[PDB]
Design a protein around this ligand. Structure first.
Ligand code: EKL
Length: 259
């Protein structure tokens, strides 16, 4: 790639992100005074474990749907073979969601936007996975302290998704080329905006992996306890990405083949 080509890549990734960001930043900021009351938090804490799981799994899947669309619109992604598209989304979609989530996290009062209002960690007690929840809140706090712009989130999530180290890729060199061009774009944009200092402050790649592993591990516990709930009331796409041996569905293929 050349230098104008890199800045065109920057513009194209930012555009692809804006079209698929699910919620515009201002819509999340405008709701920050809308906080759950103590009575509403209590109501969430008294919901059954299985109903809170279903609701949370539903919201995760919705967010993952916008990530799939981001990929489909991401320069060079659809030129990868189908196998590698699926590999990359299977391993990276939850990671992208976790990074995007920091937009919905208010570091001032330690709350996250959830079902129309902002609430803290205690909102999720009924899940029985406090360690996973606090890890996500802590990760969202760490990213909020960097004050990502929307352009930086677009470029960083492109790189989270386009990761040539995922096991199972068939055209590893093609993914490497794509990853390298997106890295140049991200680092070029940081340099031009005098934001190279955040590079040392970004989370190690093992953190994002660790959060996704905790998620799958707590899901396995839940699915053992409530197997019919997962079968009857979890989104098919969710089960395909995270469940075992829930990889019996083929939703990703249909989502990618469409359009
Ligand atoms: C850390 C606490 N938390 C969760 C914890 C667990 C969980 O589910 C899995 C555990 C087992 C299933 C699910 C959530 C969960 C979901 C939401 C959510 O969807 N809010 C609505 C919203 C819409 C758009 C945006 S965005 O535009 O920024 C692009 C992402 C962000 C937010 C918020 C907090 C959550």
């Amino acid at each position: 790639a050349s230098l104008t080509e890199i800045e065109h890549l920057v513009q194209s990734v930012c555009k692809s992100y804006r079209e698929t960001c699910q919620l515009r930043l201002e819509d999340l900021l405008r709701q920050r005074s809308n906080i759950f009351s103590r009575e509403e938090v209590t109501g969430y804490q008294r919901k059954s474990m299985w109903e809170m799981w279903e609701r949370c799994a539903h919201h995760l899947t919705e967010a993952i749907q916008y990530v799939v669309e981001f990929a489909k619109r991401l320069s060079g992604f659809m030129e990868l073979c189908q196998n590698d598209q699926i590999v990359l989304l299977k391993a990276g979609a939850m990671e992208v969601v976790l990074v995007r989530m920091c937009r919905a996290y208010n570091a001032d009062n330690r709350t996250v936007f959830f079902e129309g209002k902002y609430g803290g960690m205690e909102l999720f007690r009924a899940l029985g996975c406090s360690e996973l929840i606090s890890s996500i809140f802590d990760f969202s706090h760490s990213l909020s302290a960097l004050h990502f712009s929307e352009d930086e989130i677009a470029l960083y999530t492109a790189l989270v998704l386009i990761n040539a180290h995922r096991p199972g890729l068939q055209e590893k060199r093609k993914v490497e080329q794509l990853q390298y061009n997106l890295e140049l774009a991200f680092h070029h944009h940081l340099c031009k905006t005098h934001r190279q200092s955040i590079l040392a402050k970004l989370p190690p790649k093992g953190k994002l992996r660790s959060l996704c592993s905790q998620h799958v591990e707590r899901l396995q516990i839940f699915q053992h306890l409530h197997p019919i709930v997962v079968q009857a009331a979890f989104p098919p796409l969710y089960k395909e990405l995270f469940s075992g041996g829930g990889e019996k569905h083929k939703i990703l293929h249909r989502l990618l083949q469409d359009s």
